[PDB]
């Protein structure tokens, strides 16, 4: 379902290359708002706009979405909560 959220939210047809389970305090420094769980960060890439797309969900098996971060070349990233 993860590949589909990103399309609904951005129109980008993309697949998950990799993912990392990070910790709440470790997210709060990047997003500004602290999650209520571990956060799987799922990573994908768009060579059309050359930018990193990355979905922040709860940990397995629930995969409850939490946020969406879209980061350009220079490395600043737009944050949309979900």
């Amino acid at each position: 379902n993860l590949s589909d959220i990103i399309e609904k939210e951005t129109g980008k047809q993309l697949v998950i290359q990799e993912s990392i389970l990070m910790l709440p305090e470790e997210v709060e420094e990047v997003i500004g708002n602290k999650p209520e769980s571990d956060i799987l960060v799922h990573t994908a890439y768009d060579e059309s706009t050359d930018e990193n797309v990355m979905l922040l969900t709860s940990d397995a098996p629930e995969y409850k979405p939490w946020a969406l971060v879209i980061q350009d070349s220079n490395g600043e990233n737009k944050i949309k909560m979900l």
Binding site: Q17, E18, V41, D59
Partner: protein, 271 residues
């Protein structure tokens, strides 16, 4: 042969192809003999039959497990625990694949077979190598066999995941990986462990800072290559300590200088 993999020439037995009965064995998958002493060890343990049982139950279900078995325990099957130098830990294997059906997962961390896309963690690694004069042109591929051979022990803290699903087999492979790391830190000596991210850090608390050298930073994922990582210390008396960001550390330029400072044939990284 098993590490120099070309996805265009990718002809490996599947799980069910290598385990026609649902019952899964692990003695088969482990080739290099210099591991049996550990391996036989973990057979004496209790989680081990339950582990093969969980794996079987996944094939009973019937999951599309990756990496394929003949590449599971790969780094082990090509690094004898004696001619090892660096231990780099991956959290969870590459879950994706290719339209060809080849999994990114080649049974080791951060490495993908040839003619296969280079994920951005590995690309940010290449960026680092270039930044610190260890490489001129970032390669077109992500086959890290030339690193494994020279003694870089790259493994995933969870050896299996189900295809396209991420972080599914943690509490299954924890008991295996912890014993592996304990075996390494206890029996062997002057290894170099590299902590990329919080999870590998958690796993490097199990290590003996009197014996081994530990590089520590944030993770090469684009979410973190530029972010510090605040966690704890290594020693018995912990303090709240902030470790630097992946792009601010000479990860590979510390390994070689330490190995030379212990009179050890260094690691040629470039490709």
């Amino acid at each position: 042969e098993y590490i120099l993999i070309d996805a265009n020439n990718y002809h490996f037995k599947s799980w069910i192809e290598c385990f026609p009965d649902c019952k899964v064995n692990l003695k088969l998958l482990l080739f290099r003999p210099e591991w049996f002493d550990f391996f036989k060890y973990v057979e004496s343990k209790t989680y081990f039959p339950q582990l093969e049982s969980k794996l079987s139950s996944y094939l009973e279900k019937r999951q599309r497990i990756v990496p394929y078995p003949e590449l599971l325990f790969n780094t082990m099957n090509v690094l004898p625990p004696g001619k090892i130098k660096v231990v780099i830990l991956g959290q969870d294997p590459y879950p994706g694949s290719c339209i060809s059906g080849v999994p990114y997962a080649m049974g080791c961390s951060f490495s993908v077979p040839l003619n296969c896309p280079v994920p951005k963690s590995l690309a940010n690694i290449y960026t680092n190598l270039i930044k610190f004069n260890h490489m001129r042109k970032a390669p077109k591929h992500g086959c890290l066999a030339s690193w494994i051979l020279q003694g870089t022990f790259m493994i995933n803290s969870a050896f299996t995941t189900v295809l396209n699903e991420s972080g599914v087999h943690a509490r299954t492979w924890e008991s295996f990986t912890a014993d592996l790391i304990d075996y390494l830190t206890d029996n062997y000596d002057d290894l170099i462990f590299v902590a990329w991210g919080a999870h590998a850090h958690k796993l490097c608390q199990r290590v003996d800072p009197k014996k081994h050298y530990i590089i520590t930073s944030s993770h090469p994922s684009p979410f973190s290559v530029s972010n510090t990582m605040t966690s704890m210390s290594y020693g018995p008396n912990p303090k709240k300590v902030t470790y630097p960001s992946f792009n601010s550390v000479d990860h590979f330029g510390k390994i070689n200088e330490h190995l030379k400072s212990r009179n050890k044939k260094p690691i040629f990284w470039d490709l």
